[PDB]
Design a protein around this ligand. Structure first.
Ligand code: HEC
Length: 104
């Protein structure tokens, strides 16, 4: 749960296509403010693939943990092209940063 170790991973691997702040813009991928507790494909204003819209699960540490390891495996047909984070601790660090930053 290293929130600052988490931030670095974020800058380095996700910042190219996402925003986490309130009212921040949609880049190639959607802004992430408010992820946690919300269903899949729910950022207002972003056009998601039907696969993402329809996944139908709630984002929490556990769904994020499985996803982030292999995004295309979890959301078949996703347009998010990213290989995933192999290491468990890296995924854990990034989730602790996201929980922090995505809820304010
Ligand atoms: C561009 C090359 C991307 C990188 C690098 C990362 N993401 Fe991404 N993400 C991107 C797109 C285009 C999409 C939408 C895909 C679709 O098929 O509609 C996504 C989606 C997400 C989601 C799902 C959000 C939801 O509303 O359910 C999440 C949590 C997400 N992206 C997070 C995320 C993180 C933490 C990343 C860094 C490891 C990351 N993405 C990389 C585009 C791109």
């Amino acid at each position: 749960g290293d929130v600052e170790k988490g931030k670095k991973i974020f800058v380095q691997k996700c910042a190219q296509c996402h925003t986490v702040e309130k009212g921040g813009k949609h880049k190639t991928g959607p802004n992430l403010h408010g992820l946690f507790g919300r269903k899949t494909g729910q950022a207002p204003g972003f056009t998601y693939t039907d696969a993402n819209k329809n996944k139908g699960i709630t984002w929490k540490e556990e769904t994020l943990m499985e996803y982030l390891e292999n995004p295309k495996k979890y959301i078949p047909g996703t347009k998010m092209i990213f290989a995933g984070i192999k290491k468990k601790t890296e995924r854990e660090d990034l989730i602790a940063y996201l929980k922090k930053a995505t809820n304010e």
